[PDB]
PDB file of C-alpha atoms in Angstrom:
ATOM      1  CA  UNK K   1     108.848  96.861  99.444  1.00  0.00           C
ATOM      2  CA  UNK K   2     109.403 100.559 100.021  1.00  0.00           C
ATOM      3  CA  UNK K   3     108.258 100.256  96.706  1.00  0.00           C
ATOM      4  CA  UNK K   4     105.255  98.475  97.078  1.00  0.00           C
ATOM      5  CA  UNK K   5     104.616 100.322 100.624  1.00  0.00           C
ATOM      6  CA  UNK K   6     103.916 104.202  98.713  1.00  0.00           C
ATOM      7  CA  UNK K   7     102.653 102.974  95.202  1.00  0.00           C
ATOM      8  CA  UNK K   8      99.697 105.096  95.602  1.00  0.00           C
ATOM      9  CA  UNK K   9     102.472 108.375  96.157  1.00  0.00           C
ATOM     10  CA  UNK K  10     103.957 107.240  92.862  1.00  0.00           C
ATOM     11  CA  UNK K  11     100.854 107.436  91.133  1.00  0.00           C
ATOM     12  CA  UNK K  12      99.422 109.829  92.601  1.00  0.00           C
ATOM     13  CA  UNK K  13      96.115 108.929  94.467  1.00  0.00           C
ATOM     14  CA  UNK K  14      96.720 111.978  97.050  1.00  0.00           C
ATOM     15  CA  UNK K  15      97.053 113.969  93.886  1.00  0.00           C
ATOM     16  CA  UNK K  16      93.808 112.977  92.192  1.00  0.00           C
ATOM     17  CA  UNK K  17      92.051 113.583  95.320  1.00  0.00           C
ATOM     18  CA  UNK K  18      93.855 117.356  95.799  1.00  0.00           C
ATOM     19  CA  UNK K  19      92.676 117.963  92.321  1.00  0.00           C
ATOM     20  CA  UNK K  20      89.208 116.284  92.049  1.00  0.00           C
ATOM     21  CA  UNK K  21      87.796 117.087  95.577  1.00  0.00           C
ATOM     22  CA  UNK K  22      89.780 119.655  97.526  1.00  0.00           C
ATOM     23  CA  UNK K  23      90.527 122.095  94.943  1.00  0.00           C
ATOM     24  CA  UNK K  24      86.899 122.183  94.226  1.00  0.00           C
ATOM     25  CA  UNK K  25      86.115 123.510  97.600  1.00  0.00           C
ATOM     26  CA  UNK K  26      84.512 126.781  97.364  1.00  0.00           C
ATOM     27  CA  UNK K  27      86.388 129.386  99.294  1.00  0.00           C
ATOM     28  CA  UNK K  28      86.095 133.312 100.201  1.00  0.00           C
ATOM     29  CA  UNK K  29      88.702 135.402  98.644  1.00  0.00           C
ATOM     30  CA  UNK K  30      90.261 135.536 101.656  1.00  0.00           C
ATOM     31  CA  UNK K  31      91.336 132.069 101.745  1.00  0.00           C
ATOM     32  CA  UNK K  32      91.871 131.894  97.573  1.00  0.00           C
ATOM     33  CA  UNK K  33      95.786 133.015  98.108  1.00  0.00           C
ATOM     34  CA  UNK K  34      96.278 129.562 100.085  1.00  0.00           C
ATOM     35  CA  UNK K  35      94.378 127.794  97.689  1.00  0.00           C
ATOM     36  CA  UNK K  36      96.311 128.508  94.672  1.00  0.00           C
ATOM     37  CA  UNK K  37      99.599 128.197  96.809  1.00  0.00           C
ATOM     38  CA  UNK K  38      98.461 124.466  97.559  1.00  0.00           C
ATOM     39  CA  UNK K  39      97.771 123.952  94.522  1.00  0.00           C
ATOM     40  CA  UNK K  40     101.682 124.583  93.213  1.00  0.00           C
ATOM     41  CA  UNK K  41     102.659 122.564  95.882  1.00  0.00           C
ATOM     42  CA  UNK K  42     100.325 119.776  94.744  1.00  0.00           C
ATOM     43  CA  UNK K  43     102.100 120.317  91.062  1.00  0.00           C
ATOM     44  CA  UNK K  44     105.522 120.534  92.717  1.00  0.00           C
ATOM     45  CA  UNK K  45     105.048 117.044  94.464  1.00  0.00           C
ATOM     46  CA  UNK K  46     103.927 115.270  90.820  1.00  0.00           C
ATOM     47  CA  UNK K  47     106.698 117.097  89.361  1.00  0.00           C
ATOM     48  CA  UNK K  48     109.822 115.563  91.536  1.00  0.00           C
ATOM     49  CA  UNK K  49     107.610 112.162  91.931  1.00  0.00           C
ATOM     50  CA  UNK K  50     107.899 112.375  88.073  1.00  0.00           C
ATOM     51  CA  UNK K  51     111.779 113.657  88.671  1.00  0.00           C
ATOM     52  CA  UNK K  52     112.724 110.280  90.004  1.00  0.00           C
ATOM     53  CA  UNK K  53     110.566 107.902  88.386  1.00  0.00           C
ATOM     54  CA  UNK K  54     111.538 109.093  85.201  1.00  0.00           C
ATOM     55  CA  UNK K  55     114.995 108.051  85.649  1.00  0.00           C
ATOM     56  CA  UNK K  56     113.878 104.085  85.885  1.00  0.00           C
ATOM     57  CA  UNK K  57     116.171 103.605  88.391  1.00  0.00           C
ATOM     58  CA  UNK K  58     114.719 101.134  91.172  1.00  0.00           C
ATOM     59  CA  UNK K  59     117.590 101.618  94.128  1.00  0.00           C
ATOM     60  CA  UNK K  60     117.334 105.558  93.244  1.00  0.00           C
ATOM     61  CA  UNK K  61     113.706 105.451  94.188  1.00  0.00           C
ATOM     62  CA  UNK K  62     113.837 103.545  97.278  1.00  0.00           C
ATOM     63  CA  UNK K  63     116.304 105.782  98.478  1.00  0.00           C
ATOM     64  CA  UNK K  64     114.384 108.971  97.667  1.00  0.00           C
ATOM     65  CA  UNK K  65     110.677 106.917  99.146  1.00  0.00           C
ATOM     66  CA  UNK K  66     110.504 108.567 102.031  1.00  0.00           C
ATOM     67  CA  UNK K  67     111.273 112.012 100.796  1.00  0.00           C
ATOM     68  CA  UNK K  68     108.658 111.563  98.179  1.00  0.00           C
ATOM     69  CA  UNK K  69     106.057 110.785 100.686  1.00  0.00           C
ATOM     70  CA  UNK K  70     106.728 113.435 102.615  1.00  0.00           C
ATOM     71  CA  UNK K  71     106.436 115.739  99.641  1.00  0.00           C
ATOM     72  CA  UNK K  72     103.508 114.740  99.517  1.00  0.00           C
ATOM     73  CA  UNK K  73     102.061 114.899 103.047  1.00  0.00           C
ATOM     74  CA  UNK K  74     102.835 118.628 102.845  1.00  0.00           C
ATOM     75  CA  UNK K  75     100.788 119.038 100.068  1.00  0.00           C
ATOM     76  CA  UNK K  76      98.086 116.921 101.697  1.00  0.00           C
ATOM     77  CA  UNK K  77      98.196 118.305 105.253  1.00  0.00           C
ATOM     78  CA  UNK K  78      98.284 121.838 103.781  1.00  0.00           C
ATOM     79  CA  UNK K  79      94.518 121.116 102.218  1.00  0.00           C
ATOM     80  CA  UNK K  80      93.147 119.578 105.368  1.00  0.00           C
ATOM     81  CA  UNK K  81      94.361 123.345 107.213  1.00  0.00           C
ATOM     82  CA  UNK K  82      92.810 124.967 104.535  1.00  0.00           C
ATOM     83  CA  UNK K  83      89.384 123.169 104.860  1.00  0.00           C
ATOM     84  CA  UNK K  84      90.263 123.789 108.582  1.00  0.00           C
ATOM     85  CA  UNK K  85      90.297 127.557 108.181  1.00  0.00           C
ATOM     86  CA  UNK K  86      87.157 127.758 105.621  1.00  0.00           C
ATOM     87  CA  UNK K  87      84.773 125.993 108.136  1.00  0.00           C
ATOM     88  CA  UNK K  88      86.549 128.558 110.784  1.00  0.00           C
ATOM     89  CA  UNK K  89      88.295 131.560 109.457  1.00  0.00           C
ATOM     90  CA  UNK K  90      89.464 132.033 113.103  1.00  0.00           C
ATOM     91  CA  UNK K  91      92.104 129.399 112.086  1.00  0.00           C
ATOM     92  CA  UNK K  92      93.215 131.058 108.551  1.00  0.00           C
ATOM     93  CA  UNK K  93      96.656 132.839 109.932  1.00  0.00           C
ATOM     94  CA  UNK K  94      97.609 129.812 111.674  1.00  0.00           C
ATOM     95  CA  UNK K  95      97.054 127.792 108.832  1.00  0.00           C
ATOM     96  CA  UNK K  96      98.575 130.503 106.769  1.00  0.00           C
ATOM     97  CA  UNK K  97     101.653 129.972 108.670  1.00  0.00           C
ATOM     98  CA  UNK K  98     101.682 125.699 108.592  1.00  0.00           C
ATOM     99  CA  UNK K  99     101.581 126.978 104.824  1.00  0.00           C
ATOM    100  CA  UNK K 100     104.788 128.877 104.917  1.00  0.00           C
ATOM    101  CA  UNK K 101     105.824 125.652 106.787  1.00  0.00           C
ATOM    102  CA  UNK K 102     105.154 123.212 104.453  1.00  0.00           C
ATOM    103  CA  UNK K 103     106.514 125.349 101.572  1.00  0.00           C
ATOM    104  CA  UNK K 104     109.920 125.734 103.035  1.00  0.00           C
ATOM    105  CA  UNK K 105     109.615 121.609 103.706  1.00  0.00           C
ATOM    106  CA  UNK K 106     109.123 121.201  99.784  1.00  0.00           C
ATOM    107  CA  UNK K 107     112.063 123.210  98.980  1.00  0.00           C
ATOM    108  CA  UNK K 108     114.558 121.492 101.136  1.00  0.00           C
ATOM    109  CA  UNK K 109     113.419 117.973  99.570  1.00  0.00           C
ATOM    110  CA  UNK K 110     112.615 119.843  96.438  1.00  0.00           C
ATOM    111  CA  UNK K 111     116.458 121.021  96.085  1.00  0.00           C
ATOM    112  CA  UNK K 112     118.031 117.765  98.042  1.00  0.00           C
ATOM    113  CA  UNK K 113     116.325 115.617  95.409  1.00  0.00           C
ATOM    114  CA  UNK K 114     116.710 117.518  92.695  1.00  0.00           C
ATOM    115  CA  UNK K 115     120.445 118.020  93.262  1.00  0.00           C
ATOM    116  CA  UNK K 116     121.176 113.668  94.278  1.00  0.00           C
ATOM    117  CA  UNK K 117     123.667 112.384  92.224  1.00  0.00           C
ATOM    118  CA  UNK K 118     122.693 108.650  91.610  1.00  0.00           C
ATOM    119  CA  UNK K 119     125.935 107.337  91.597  1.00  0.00           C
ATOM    120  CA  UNK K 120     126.087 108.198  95.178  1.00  0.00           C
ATOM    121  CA  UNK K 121     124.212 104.893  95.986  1.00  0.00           C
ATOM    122  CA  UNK K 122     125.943 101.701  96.117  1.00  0.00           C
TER     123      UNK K 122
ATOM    124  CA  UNK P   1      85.329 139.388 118.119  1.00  0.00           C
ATOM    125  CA  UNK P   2      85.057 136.380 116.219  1.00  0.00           C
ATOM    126  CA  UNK P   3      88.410 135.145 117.492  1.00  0.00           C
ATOM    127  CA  UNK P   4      87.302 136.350 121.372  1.00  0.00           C
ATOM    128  CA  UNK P   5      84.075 134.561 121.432  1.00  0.00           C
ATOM    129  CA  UNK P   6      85.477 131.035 120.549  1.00  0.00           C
ATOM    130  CA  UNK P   7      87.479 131.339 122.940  1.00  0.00           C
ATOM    131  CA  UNK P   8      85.762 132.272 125.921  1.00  0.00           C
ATOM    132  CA  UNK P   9      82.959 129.510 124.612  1.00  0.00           C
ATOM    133  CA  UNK P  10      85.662 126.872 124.552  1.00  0.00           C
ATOM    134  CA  UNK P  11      84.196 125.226 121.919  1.00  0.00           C
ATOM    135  CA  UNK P  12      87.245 124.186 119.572  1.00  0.00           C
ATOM    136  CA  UNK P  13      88.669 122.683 123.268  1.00  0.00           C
ATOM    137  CA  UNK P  14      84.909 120.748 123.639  1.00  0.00           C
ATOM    138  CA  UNK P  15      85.351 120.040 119.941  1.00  0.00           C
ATOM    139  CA  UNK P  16      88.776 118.024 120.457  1.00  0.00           C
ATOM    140  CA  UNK P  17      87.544 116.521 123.519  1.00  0.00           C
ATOM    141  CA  UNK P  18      84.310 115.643 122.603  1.00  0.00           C
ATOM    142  CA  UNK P  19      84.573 114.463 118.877  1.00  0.00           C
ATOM    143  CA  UNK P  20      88.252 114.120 118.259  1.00  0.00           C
ATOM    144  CA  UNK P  21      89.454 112.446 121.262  1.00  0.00           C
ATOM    145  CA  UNK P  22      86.767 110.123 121.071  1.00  0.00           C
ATOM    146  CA  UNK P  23      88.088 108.513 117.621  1.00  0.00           C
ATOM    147  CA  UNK P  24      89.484 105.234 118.733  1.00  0.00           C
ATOM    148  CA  UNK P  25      92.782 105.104 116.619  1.00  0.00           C
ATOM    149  CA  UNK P  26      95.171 102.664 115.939  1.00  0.00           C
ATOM    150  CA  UNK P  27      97.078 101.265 118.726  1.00  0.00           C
ATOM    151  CA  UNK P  28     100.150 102.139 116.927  1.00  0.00           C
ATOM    152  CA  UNK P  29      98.543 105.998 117.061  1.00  0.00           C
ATOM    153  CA  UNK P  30      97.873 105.701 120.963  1.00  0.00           C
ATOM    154  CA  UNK P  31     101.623 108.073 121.672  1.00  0.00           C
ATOM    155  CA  UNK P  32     100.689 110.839 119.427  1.00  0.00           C
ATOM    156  CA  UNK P  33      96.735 111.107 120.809  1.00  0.00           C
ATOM    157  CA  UNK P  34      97.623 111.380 123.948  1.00  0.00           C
ATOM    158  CA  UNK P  35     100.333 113.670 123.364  1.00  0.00           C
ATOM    159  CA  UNK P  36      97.657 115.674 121.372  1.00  0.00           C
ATOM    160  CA  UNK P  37      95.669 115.925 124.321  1.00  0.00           C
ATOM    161  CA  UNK P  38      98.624 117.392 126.424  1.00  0.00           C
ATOM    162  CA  UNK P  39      98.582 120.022 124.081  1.00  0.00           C
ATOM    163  CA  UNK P  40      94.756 120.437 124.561  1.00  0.00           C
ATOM    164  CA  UNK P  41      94.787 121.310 128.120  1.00  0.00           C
ATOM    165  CA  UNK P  42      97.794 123.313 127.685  1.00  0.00           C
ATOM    166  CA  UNK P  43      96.082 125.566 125.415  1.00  0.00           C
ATOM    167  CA  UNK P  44      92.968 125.121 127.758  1.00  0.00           C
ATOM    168  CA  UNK P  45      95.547 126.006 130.428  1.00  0.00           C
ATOM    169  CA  UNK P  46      96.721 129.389 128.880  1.00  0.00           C
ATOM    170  CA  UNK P  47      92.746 130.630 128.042  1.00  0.00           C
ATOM    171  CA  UNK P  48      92.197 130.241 131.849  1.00  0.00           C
ATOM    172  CA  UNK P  49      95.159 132.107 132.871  1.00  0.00           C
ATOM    173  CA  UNK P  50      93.907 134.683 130.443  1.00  0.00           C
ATOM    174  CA  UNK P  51      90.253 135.042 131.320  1.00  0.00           C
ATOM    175  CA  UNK P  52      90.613 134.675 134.829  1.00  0.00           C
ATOM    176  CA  UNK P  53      91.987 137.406 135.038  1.00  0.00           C
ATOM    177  CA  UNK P  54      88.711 139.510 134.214  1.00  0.00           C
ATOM    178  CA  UNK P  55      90.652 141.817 132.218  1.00  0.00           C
ATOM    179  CA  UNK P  56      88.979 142.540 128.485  1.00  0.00           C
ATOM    180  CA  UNK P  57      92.159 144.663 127.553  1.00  0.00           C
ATOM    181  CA  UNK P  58      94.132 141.348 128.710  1.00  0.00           C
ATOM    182  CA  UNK P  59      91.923 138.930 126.344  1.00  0.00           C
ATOM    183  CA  UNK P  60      91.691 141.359 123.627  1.00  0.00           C
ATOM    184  CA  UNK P  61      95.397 141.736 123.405  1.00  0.00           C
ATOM    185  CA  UNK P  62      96.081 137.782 123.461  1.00  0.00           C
ATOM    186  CA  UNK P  63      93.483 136.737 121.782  1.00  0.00           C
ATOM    187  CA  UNK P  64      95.208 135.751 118.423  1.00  0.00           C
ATOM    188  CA  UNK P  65      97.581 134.415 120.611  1.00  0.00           C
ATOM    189  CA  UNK P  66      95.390 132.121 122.203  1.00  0.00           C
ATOM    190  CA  UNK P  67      93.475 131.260 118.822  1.00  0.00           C
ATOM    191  CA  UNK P  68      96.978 130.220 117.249  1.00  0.00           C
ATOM    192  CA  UNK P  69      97.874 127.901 120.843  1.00  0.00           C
ATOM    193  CA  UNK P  70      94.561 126.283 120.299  1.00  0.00           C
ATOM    194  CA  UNK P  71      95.015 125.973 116.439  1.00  0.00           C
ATOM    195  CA  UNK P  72      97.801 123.927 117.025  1.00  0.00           C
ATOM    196  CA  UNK P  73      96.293 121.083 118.749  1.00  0.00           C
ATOM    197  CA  UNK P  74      93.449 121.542 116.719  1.00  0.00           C
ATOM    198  CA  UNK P  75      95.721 121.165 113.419  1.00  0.00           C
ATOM    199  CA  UNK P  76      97.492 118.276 115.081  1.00  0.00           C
ATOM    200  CA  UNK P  77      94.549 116.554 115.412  1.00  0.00           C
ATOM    201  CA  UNK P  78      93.507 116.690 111.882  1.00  0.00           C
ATOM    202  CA  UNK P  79      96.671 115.516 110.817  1.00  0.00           C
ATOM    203  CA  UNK P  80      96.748 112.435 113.437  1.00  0.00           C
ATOM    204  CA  UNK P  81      93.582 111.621 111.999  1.00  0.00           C
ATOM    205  CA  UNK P  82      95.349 111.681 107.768  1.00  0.00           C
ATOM    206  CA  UNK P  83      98.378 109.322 109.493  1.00  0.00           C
ATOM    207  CA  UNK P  84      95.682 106.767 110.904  1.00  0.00           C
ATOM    208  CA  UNK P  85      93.979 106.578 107.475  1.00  0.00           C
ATOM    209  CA  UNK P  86      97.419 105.913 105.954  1.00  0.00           C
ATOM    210  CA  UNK P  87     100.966 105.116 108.093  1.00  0.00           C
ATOM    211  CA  UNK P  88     102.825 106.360 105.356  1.00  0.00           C
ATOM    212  CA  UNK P  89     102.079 109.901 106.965  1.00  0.00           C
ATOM    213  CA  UNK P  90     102.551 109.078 110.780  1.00  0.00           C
ATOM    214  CA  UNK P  91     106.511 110.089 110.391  1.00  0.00           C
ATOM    215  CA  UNK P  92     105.344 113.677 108.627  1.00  0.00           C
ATOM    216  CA  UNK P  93     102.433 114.009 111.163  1.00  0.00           C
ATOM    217  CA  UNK P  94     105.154 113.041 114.099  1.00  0.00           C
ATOM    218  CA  UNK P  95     107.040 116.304 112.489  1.00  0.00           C
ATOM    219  CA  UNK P  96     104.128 118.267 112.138  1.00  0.00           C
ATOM    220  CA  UNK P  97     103.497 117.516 115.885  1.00  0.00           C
ATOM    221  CA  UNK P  98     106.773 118.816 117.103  1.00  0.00           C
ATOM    222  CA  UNK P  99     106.513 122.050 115.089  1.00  0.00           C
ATOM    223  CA  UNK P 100     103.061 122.660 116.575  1.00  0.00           C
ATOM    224  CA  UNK P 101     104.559 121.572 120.520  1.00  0.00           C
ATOM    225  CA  UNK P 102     107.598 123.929 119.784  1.00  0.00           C
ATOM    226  CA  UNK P 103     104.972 126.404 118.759  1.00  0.00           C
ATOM    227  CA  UNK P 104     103.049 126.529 122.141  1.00  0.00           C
ATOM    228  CA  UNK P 105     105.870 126.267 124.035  1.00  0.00           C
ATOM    229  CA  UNK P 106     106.838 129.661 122.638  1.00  0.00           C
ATOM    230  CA  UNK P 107     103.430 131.061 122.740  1.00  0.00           C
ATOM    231  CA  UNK P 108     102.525 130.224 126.276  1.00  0.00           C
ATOM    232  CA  UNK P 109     105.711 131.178 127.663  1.00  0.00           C
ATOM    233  CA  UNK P 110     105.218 134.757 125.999  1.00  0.00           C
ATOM    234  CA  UNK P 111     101.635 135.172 127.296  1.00  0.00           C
ATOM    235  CA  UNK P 112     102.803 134.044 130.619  1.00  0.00           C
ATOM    236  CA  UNK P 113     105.601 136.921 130.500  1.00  0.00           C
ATOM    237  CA  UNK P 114     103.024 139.586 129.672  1.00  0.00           C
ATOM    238  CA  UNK P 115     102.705 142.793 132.026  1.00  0.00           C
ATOM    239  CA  UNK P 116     101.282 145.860 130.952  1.00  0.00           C
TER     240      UNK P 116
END
């Protein structure tokens, strides 16, 4: 159900895209520090998807659904800025800063998940 | 220069008006659009209490300022647009939203303090 409602996060369709299309975006050096920092957070989000499902344990990842969705978003949103800010480098220090954003996001659910004990679930 | 231009031609505010705004979204989507517009005529709001003020030393000096307020509804836009392509982002984009309000709030209430 939860499940079911982000099987596309656990496989990693957001992923594919960040990899196939948006990190193929030509960009002036300027905006290559961003790029590269998206792209760890785009590893960092298959990494702790790959965390949990790992573990094969169905309640564990329907706890942690959310949390892995939103893992993801930051990685997501962070692109869309980016192609934001190469169409209009007017916006690259604002986006640089939704950047800083989304990286302390990660962390937190990086560290939360990371540090769950699974026997905390009932 | 680049920055000072934009926004004395408006044209991210015509942008968001004019071609965001315009996407019909899903119903569910309806709070956060027009909560995104809010934010587009406060930003709008600040650029006018700038620039009325015929001052080029004013608009020079918050210029960056007034870039970042408009960047924000700008951004929020973009990311209204990822949660109505897929709801499993609306509660992130709902955060991102806040951040961005929390933002401007800060921003215009420092431009509005300014004196020389």
């Amino acid at each position: 159900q939860v499940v079911a409602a982000i099987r596309h996060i656990t496989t990693g369709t957001y992923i594919a895209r960040i990899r196939e299309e948006y990190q193929q975006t030509e960009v002036k050096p300027e905006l290559q520090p961003m790029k590269e920092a998206l792209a760890r957070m785009t590893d960092r989000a298959e990494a702790l998807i790959a965390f949990v499902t790992e573990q094969k344990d169905q309640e564990l990842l329907d706890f942690q659904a959310r949390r892995l969705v939103e893992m993801t978003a930051h990685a997501v949103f962070g692109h869309l800025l980016m192609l934001a800010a190469n169409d209009d480098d007017s916006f690259r220090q604002s986006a640089e800063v939704y950047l800083r954003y989304g990286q302390a996001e990660q962390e937190k659910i990086d560290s939360y998940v990371r540090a769950f004990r699974p026997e905390e679930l009932t």
